[PDB]
Design a protein. Sequence first.
Length: 274
Amino acid sequence: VTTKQWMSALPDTTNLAALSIPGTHDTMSYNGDITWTLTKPLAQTQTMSLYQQLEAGIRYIDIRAKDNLNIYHGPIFLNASLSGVLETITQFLKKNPKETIIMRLKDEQNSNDSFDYRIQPLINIYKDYFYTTPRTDTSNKIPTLKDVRGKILLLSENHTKKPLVINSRKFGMQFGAPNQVIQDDYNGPSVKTKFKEIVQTAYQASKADNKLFLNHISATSLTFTPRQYAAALNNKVEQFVLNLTSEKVRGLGILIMDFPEKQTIKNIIKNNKF
Ligand SMILES: O[C@H]1[C@H](O)[C@@H](O)[C@H](O)[C@@H](O)[C@H]1O
């Protein structure tokens, strides 16, 4: 099967939590302004553009914005807007209608509630492309592929600490909600330690089927760049996944990476059953 349409080949009845999904950390940090090129080794986390990542099989993206609706990496402008991102993602789903995309949307200045209101008009323009439930529904249950076909599962992260509610509909769910387990030890861990946490989280992910696992392979430190961690960790993660596939262990959750190589993404995909 093609990496461009790998989810379409999966059974409609499969739960989102039962899959091994390749994703990218700080998805848009593959280009940026002058400050971006000056701090390139510290800030860059990807080489492939958004459309290229989607075509390569990535189904989980990490978009970080500010109330001006532009994409940022802290104080660094990434030469992209949320509209441009939304249009790209939406075009991909229109072309490949069975795929689904998990999208973490973070506010870079978590000090304001103005982010929630400002993004609403833009998100509303693409309402037909978002997985949505009624406001009253607090079921929190993880959807089935049938329900998210050709749609975006939004994971909101901002000051309000609540899910994006536009009109009477609740858009996606809250990032960090009780139905998702997150491993995000980014703050300078040793390679050995980081690997243990990745492996432990993947192990726990296999035993459960009622929660979403966001397992970050990514990290930084004052003396080790994202590029350096990826070069050490990605291959180790890849071989671990290859092994588990032999033991018939599937549904490892969302493996969120920096600088993922095409072959690595394919092997994570192959962990699912077709
Ligand atoms: O710099 C970190 C890092 O990128 C983590 O992966 C992300 O989850 C945190 O929100 C962010 O502050």
